[PDB]
Amino acid sequence: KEAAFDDAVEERVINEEYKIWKKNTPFLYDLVMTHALEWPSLTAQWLPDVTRPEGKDFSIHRLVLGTHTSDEQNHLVIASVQLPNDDAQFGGFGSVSGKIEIEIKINHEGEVNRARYMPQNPCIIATKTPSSDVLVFDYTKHPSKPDPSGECNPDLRLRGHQKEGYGLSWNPNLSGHLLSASDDHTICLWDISAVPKEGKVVDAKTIFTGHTAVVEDVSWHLLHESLFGSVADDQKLMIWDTRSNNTSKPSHSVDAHTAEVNCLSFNPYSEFILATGSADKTVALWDLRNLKLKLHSFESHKDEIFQVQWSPHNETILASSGTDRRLNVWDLSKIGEEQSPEDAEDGPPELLFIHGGHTAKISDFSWNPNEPWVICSVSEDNIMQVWQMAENIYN
Amino acid sequence: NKRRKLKNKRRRSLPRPHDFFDAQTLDAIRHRAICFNLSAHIESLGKGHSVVFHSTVIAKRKEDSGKIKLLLHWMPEDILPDVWVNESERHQLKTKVVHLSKLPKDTALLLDPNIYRTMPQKRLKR
Amino acid sequence: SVNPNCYAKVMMVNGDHRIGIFAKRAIQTGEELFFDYRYSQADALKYVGIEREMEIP
Amino acid sequence: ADHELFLQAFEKPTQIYRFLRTRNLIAPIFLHRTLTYMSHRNSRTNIKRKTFKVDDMLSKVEKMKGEQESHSHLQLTFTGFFHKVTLEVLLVKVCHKKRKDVSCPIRQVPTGKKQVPLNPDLNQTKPSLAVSSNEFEPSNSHMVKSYSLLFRVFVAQMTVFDKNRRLQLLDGEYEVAMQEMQGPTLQFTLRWT
Amino acid sequence: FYQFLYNNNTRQQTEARDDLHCPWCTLNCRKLYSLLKHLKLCHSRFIFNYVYHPKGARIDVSINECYDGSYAGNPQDIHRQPGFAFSRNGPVKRTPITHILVCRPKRTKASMSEFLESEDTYSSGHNRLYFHSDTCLPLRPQEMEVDSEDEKDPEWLREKTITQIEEFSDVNEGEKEVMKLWNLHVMKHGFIADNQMNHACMLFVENYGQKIIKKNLCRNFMLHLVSMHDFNLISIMSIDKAVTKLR
Amino acid sequence: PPPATQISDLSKRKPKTEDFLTFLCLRGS
Amino acid sequence: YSFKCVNSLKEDHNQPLFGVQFNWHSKEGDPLVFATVGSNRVTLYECHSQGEIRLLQSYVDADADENFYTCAWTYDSNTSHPLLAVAGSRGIIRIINPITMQCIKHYVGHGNAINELKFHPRDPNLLLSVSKDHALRLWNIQTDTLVAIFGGVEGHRDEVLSADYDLLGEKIMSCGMDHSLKLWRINSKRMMNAIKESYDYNPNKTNRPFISQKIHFPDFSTRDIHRNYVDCVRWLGDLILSKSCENAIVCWKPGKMEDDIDKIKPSESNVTILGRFDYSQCDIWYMRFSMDFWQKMLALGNQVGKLYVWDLEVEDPHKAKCTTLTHHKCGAAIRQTSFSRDSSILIAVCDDASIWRWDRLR
Known part of the structure; x- marks a missing residue:
């Protein structure tokens, strides 16, 4: 059909726009981070807690996400990222070892419809799942390593909703x-x-x-x-x-x-x-x-x-x-x-x-404390985007 | 690396990385553009940034006074909502030129769906 | 490549001559590997003339 | 050599770029006024000190300024059809598209009809009035787009309202063209009794 | 003036319609710096140069020979059959990747005296798509780990050596089977030491001692053992072990 | 080609068939 | 023998022409459609009475600048729609459905180029694409999964360009510029297991991809038949035809004349030569002949533009009573020939974009 043909043409277009956006990106953005994840995550949010290492521009930040997969086991994941507090430090800015990784994995059921940390203690979180019960977790009690057995422990999960x-x-x-x-x-x-x-x-x-x-x-x-x-x-x-x-x-x-x-x-x-x-x-x-x-x-x-x-x-x-x-x-x-x-x-x-700047549609975008001028964003293409606008627009 | 220069530091001559575009889609786009110019005349009359609107009348309206009005209509049928005009300002509105930035929201997809396609095209998932 | 991350080295094993390859420098994930074929200079231009290098200075 | 082959080499890149301009001029990828070298654009600084509770009473200021009302109870008197058979009229209601539905639904009602003679030009007879109640409702127009009217002897359409919350028609005389499947045309005038 | 050059073999020159205006994007640049900056970024498919004019400004352009036009998303999607490609209708396992492109914008001030005279990549991870070495076929990230494709001994090699055994005429089939099993035992495990040599003995008898009974080629196999004891790779008690395993 | 007429060469190159516009694109053939 | 040229059309591109194909995969009463591959154009035609030929839908590879070499008619049981696979110098297989007007099955993986295309006589979903890198790969297009590959460590050390299926699809002959004659038995117990498993595969079933097999040990090989390049061998039932640049066509059977083809061991090396249908004026390779549907009539063109025609009846190379048909207008290079699903229509294709139809004079 023509719609299939036009979508195929649209596939070329989005590739072109990303290429064009990439070309103009450095002169309009003060930071460009990109990372692709194995399985798409519907939502993402920054941990309020943050720490900046001494004498090191890259700041220690932690992000929490879920897992969406075709037929495999899903996990609840927390990942850390390093971002240069000082841009004067020019392995573009830091070491060649990389500035992003994942540390926490716990078996998750279905896909995370919605998940957040309760403010008075970010360690405890609640997760919206395809199941009726709203699952609750704290990464402190649960092991950081994924449990291959497939069992999950939604301790203190919430009942009351008939469906997801x-x-x-x-x-x-x-x-x-x-x-x-x-x-x-x-x-x-x-x-x-x-x-x-x-x-x-x-x-x-x-x-x-x-x-x-x-x-x-x-x-x-x-x-x-x-x-x-x-x-x-x-x-x-x-x-x-x-x-x-x-x-x-x-x-x-x-x-x-x-x-x-x-x-x-x-x-x-x-x-x-x-x-x-x-x-x-x-x-x-x-x-x-x-x-x-x-x-x-x-x-x-x-x-x-x-x-x-x-x-x-x-x-x-x-x-x-x-x-x-x-x-x-x-x-x-x-x-x-x-x-x-x-x-x-x-x-x-x-x-x-x-x-x-994303080929795929973005389902979540989130900034963090201590960094008002950067936004993390999650697209369908498993892409994690973090970027800082030029100060010139806001003087 | 502190002395890291621009991104150009790659190579002198390497095999081409193969172009993503294709020919048969290129011709279809051109003919779509060609037939687009046959009515909108962006390239011929609008100089690549404007569209020409020629006015036609669907209904003639006369009030109690001499303010007889006409309802001007334009051939693309994707044009702005249809408006009442009087007889005095007939015959020069017969050629209206509107910039691209001034086009209405819905007209973006009316002129060409390929201007913006909602890629899912349906509610496969949230 | 003329500036490879790997080099060739003949070795003697159990009366059998073999050649192995070793990393000329420490190497991270996903690198492309290179080593000097070590032909003549004219031969090098004949076959391996591509050097893929920009001059920083 | 021949410039035609030279142009042929560059035709596709230019044709691609011409389409790229058109879409971005409609759906841009970025804000050009944010360009550093285009600094004259948006030269005004961001005065973040500007408060926002002021928007509350300012909204009230424009609202009583922009108060709207409608006449009341559409009416229209018939006039002879002109062409070189009776005629029917229809009323339609257009609704906004929701998330699940692919195209915006439209509902139609048979408002009425009139026994117009066979192309009555002049001195046809000794008039009849079509009565319309307050079918249109601003609260309904909140959930659906503006209504419209249909005419069939043969198709013609005429819309009553606009999204600017201002009525399009008035009590003057009207003569709409009548298209089939200048030319056929029906005349009348609008009233508000 | 706009100059279009094809190896100087054929060339066309046009005149600018108003100054500081993009011919393609139709942008009123209002700065030649904003113009030239617009040219490179927006029209990346081409190359551009400034050659000066009797008035002062003249631009020559040509195609980008090394233009980077290619698909940017997941490489594994391109090689799928049409329809299956560009699906975007379900989660897709894809290899991790990370790139760094902006550490700090230079934000240098505009200057034409330097700009006209001049005119006159922190990636990380498995970026490109890899292919099945055995069959020249594209891999998938799903099996990207277990894919050694390599082992002690390829199958075809086993076939070739067995065929070469049959060529020998002086060897009776009773012996011929003996080394077939014994050799195929060897590059299956690749022993290299004398200690391994002995350990291979009770190992080989352990796995195939029943098959020795099945082939009823024991007596030839004891003699085949004795040769190693003549070659010092076998001790007497090792021979005793084979007798016990056989019986 | 001897007349470097204008930027109109773009308007000459694209509509080579199907009623070439402006009736003057033939000059920069 | 009872034949004459009745029609002749020439393509306007003037490119050299290549493999012809007549849709024998038809039904009784169907329009008689045949196809031909050019440099980058692909064209189909249907023969008609009075000598008329109606040009059918024709396409061009405007994206891949390569010379197409081989093609084979295809049929889909599911939609009952016929198709036709194509190939060329870039070693990529495309299969266009005339009902779909398009190709949607993309298959790559061969090294340099493809020089032979032929389907299984029984299963239409199996194809052999002989390649320039000496490789013999099999595809299960219905499952789009690869099947066992032939050649490898002990295969042809030179480019193979000619291969054939037997009538029942049990043994596959192969010959290349090395003049080697290697065949492999399909009926080998291992293979149909894979072929069955080739039809039993799901990409989403597991991360492990499908395991196509590899072969290196033909049931027989030799090179004594020709001292020059061989480019035309066919399964004459249990007998094997073979043609070289040396202006001779020879038929032969393995071992001794009494030896069963299917009983021959791989270790065998004896030959039985029983063919002398020799020719001339065609000392160059890359010429392919044609066969009637019923295997009763052989017609071969010529570089100088003549025809070399013999029947497959009791007429034998003992005397080789040739029929040298010739049209004066065609003399440049007869690249290929193609029969219909009968012995009534013959289409001869010349290199210079021109074709020459000969209709039976019966």
Whole structure:
């Protein structure tokens, strides 16, 4: 068919774009890291803990990931990486021995739909799996080496969701409190701090049934342990508060966009600012007070977006990426700012930066503390991308 | 290595690494480009950066006053949403030129799907 | 190559002459191996004239 | 030698680059205004000190500035068909495409019909009015695109609303072309009783 | 002025349509530095040079002979049959790789006096795709480890030596089988020491002593042993061991 | 070829068939 | 003997022409389609009455700048769609389905070039591609898995260019510029195990790839037949034809005349020569003759453009009553010949892009 023919032509195109992007990359990026992994990982996140060796530009950072394979055993993996804190040190910058590796492997079941570390102790993590039970692990107790027997030990795993799903959020203030979303259209809660030796499987402490559709995103307010919200395919998001009697009636509600929405992100600095993307090539934000009026909308993306995050150390920076194989950076301080015609033809003033250096679609992008100017990103092609923009754009 | 010069330090003459492109796709793209210029005239009339829109009228609208209007329409059928214009500004809008940066969002795929293809093309997986 | 990471060395084993190869320098994963064929200079241009080297100075 | 063969050698690289320009001018790989040597672009500094709670009341400022309303209850009176057989009219509703569905669904309704004579030019008879209720709804237009109308004796289309939340039509007189399978045409005027 | 050269055999010259404008990308460079920088990066498929003009600016261009046009993704995908290639519909085991391309951008300031006069790779890992040495076929990362393809003794060698045995006429078949088993025992293990020589004795009788009964070639095999005892590779108690193993 | 007309040689080289445009590309044949 | 030229067409590319192929894999009443490979073009035609020939769909290798050498008609049992494999100097096999108008089976791995193509008489999914690197590899196209390879350590020390299947597909003769005559028995107990296992393979089953086998020990070999290059040998039932540049065609059988072909041991070295259908004016190799479907009629072209024709009946080289048909218009170089699935239509192809159809005068 012509669609097959055009896709084959498209295969040539993406190779060309990567080649062209590679050609211009050094003059626009201050760092270029690339690594390919044996089996694709759906999501990735930085360990908050970091250490910088003395007299050594390369900084010790640790990343955690899952495993997605065709038919083999999947594993939960933690990998370390070294990145030059000082760029003045010119084996391009460091030794020829390499600056990236993997240290931790534990048998994983299915693929990691979503996994994060609980903030009060990053050692303990929870993982969304194709199975109904949400698995919980701590790499300290479990061996770093993979166990070839195939057995896994999801100690203190979480029950309460009937099926798998997407959406995970630990309470930033309450230890052991996390909200999980599922295809069951229900949001389940657990209290890990209160978990006894009940059998390493914890039933949902509280179950919410607000959204009519498959709830796919749910997150606590970054400042309030009481405030939290959920986002589903219903194109309608609803704000919730703890202990608020029935678990199906939200405190507030609003339809984010005209298409499905599965991405929510509060501003860590500004309490009121809450960023909301959408599948309709559109990203927006709302106010804790002004729910009826959209503050602003962003539509530079050429496809669905479902991953959004606020830049650390930078309240004015928000980023999002999706199936368009593009990553868009936006300046809140530049919303509507007058720009030369050579800028408007390039993009809106609020649009901070656009990155497209990956042949495959990227399913996750994550920055880390202590390094506000680098972003790790995971594409379908098993590629791990870390890059630093030029300081010139932000002076 | 501190004295590491640019990336050019590789070799003098080595066998070619074989080109990824192909011929039969090249001709199809050219003819697709050729038939694209037959209507949009980017190369001939737009100088590779512009597209020509010739105006046609579908309906004639007359109000209570003398502000009789026409609904201008353009042949590519992927053009901007159809707008009402009056009789006075007929006959010079019969040739409208719009830059590529000014094209609407949906027109990106209407003119050519190959401009952007959603490679999965369907929900194989999340 | 004229500047190889490996070199040839004849050896005597149990009354049998053999030739082995050893790493002229320490070598990491995935290297390409080279050694000097050690023909005449004119012969070297005749067959192995490719040197694949950029001059840093 | 012949430049035709010389051009032939360079034709493919140029043809490739011409298409590459076209797509990037539509779907760029990077922001040219971020180029170091293109520094005149985006010359303004990033004033990160600019607050963002100001966007809250500024949004209200534009909203009461941009308050919208619609007439109320479409009406239209018939006028003779012009051509060198009765006529029917249809109304359609267009909806946005969701994640699972491949193409944006559209729903149609048979709004009504009228017994137009066989190409009545002038002095045909002694008029009839088509009554439309408040079928259009801004809340519905939140979930679906704007509606449109169909005319068949023979196909013609005319859309009521735009995504700018502003009505396209008004109570003046109308005369739309009528295409089959200048030329056939039907006339009328719009009312709001 | 734009100069196109084909070994100077055939050449065409054109005149620029407005200055500081890209003929292909149609970018108003507004800087000849931004122009020349645009030329190399955007039009990498070609080469470019500055040759100066009576006005001051003239550019000559030609094809990149060593243009790097090739597929950049997983090499194993290219050689799959069409349809199976460019699948991207499931996880694919692929060899690890890492490259480093930017340690620090130089960020040197623009300067034409130096730029016109001048005009006038930290990889790591198994990058390229490897092939089956035995059959000249592409490998897959799945079996990239166990693939020694090499051992003590190739099969065809076993065939050739057996055939060469039959050529001998003075040897009765009772003896002929003896060294066939014994030799095939040898390069199977590749013993090299006298101690191994003895250890091979009880080893060979242990594995094939029943087959000796089956072939009923024992007496020839004792004599074959005695030769080694004449060659000092066998002791008397070693001979006793064979008798016990046989019986 | 003797007339180095313009940059139009690109517009001469590509549409060699199928109604070559501008009617003047024949000069730089 | 009862033949005359009735048609002649010439390709416009003027490139040297190569192996011809007539779709004998047809059904009764099907259009009589034949194919031919040029330098880089591939062309198909169907013979018609009155001497007309209707040009059919023709393609060109506009990407690989190489001279195609061999081709073989192909058929798919699953879709009932016929195909035709091709090969050339680059040693790459392409199989185009006319129903698909395209080739979607890509097979590489041979060293230098391919100089012979032929299918198994029974299984259409097995093919031998004789190569320039002296290699004899087998492919299971239906499973796309490689099958055992022949030659190797004790194979031909020179390039093989001519090989043939027997009628039942049990022994395969091989001859090359070394003038060696090596054959291998398919029926060897080991092989059909692999052939069965060749049809039983899944790439996702395990990391271990399929194990094609290797052979180095032909059931017989010799070189005494010709003192010059040999390029044309065929399985005349239990008898073996053989043609060299020395302007002679000789048929022969292994060992003594009473010795069974299938009883011959690899150690055998005796020869029984019973063929003298000699010719002339063709002292150069890379010429291939043609056979009728029923193995009853032999026709060979000539460099000077004539024909050398004999039947496979009781007519024997005892007298060799030749039939030297000749067309005056064709004299440059008759590169190949091809019969139909009958003895009625003969198509002779000249090197200079020109073909010359001869129809039976019966």
